Design an enzyme around this catalytic site. Structure first.
Site, PDB file in Angstrom:
ATOM      1  N   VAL A  38      -2.504  26.783 -80.858  1.00  0.00           N
ATOM      2  CA  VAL A  38      -2.223  25.320 -80.871  1.00  0.00           C
ATOM      3  C   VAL A  38      -3.398  24.492 -80.345  1.00  0.00           C
ATOM      4  CG1 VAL A  38      -0.720  23.533 -79.816  1.00  0.00           C
ATOM      5  CG2 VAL A  38       0.254  25.583 -80.741  1.00  0.00           C
ATOM      6  N   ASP A  39      -3.879  23.604 -81.189  1.00  0.00           N
ATOM      7  CA  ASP A  39      -5.102  22.843 -80.985  1.00  0.00           C
ATOM      8  C   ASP A  39      -4.978  21.787 -79.909  1.00  0.00           C
ATOM      9  OD1 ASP A  39      -3.464  20.868 -82.195  1.00  0.00           O
ATOM     10  OD2 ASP A  39      -4.518  20.942 -84.097  1.00  0.00           O
ATOM     11  N   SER A  40      -3.777  21.675 -79.334  1.00  0.00           N
ATOM     12  CA  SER A  40      -3.383  20.726 -78.286  1.00  0.00           C
ATOM     13  C   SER A  40      -3.177  19.304 -78.827  1.00  0.00           C
ATOM     14  CB  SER A  40      -4.308  20.763 -77.038  1.00  0.00           C
ATOM     15  OG  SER A  40      -5.643  20.230 -77.331  1.00  0.00           O
ATOM     16  N   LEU A  41      -3.617  19.074 -80.029  1.00  0.00           N
ATOM     17  CA  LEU A  41      -3.553  17.771 -80.652  1.00  0.00           C
ATOM     18  C   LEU A  41      -2.236  17.637 -81.331  1.00  0.00           C
ATOM     19  CD1 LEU A  41      -6.878  18.828 -81.600  1.00  0.00           C
ATOM     20  CD2 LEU A  41      -6.789  16.428 -80.905  1.00  0.00           C
ATOM     21  N   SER A  42      -1.753  18.762 -81.792  1.00  0.00           N
ATOM     22  CA  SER A  42      -0.462  18.871 -82.353  1.00  0.00           C
ATOM     23  C   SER A  42       0.550  18.649 -81.268  1.00  0.00           C
ATOM     24  CB  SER A  42      -0.306  20.261 -82.957  1.00  0.00           C
ATOM     25  OG  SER A  42      -0.902  21.233 -82.115  1.00  0.00           O
TER      26      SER A  42
END
Length: 81
Positions: A38-42
């Site tokens: 998870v790109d953390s942006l999601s």
């Protein structure tokens, strides 16, 4: 009021949609942006989605303190409505 797996699956389904981490991969021991991918942006959109479904409301800001599914789940479950 959701539970451990309900929070997990709830976060996970959102994650599946944006980040792409499958529900099988999202387990509580999994750091979304480290274990999973998870790109953390999601996560930002996972937040507004989770907040809306859990009514717990965990801003991405507080989400930083929940650097794992289970940490999030811990917070989200304890703060459930």
């Amino acid at each position: 009021a959701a539970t451990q797996e309900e929070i997990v699956a709830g976060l996970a389904e959102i994650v599946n949609e944006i980040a792409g981490i499958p529900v099988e991969d999202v387990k509580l021991d999994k750091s979304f942006t480290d274990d999973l991918d998870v790109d953390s942006l999601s996560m930002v959109e996972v937040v507004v989605a989770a907040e809306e479904r859990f009514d717990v409301k965990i801003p991405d800001d507080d989400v930083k303190n929940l650097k794992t599914v289970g940490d999030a789940t811990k917070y989200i479950l304890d703060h459930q409505a």
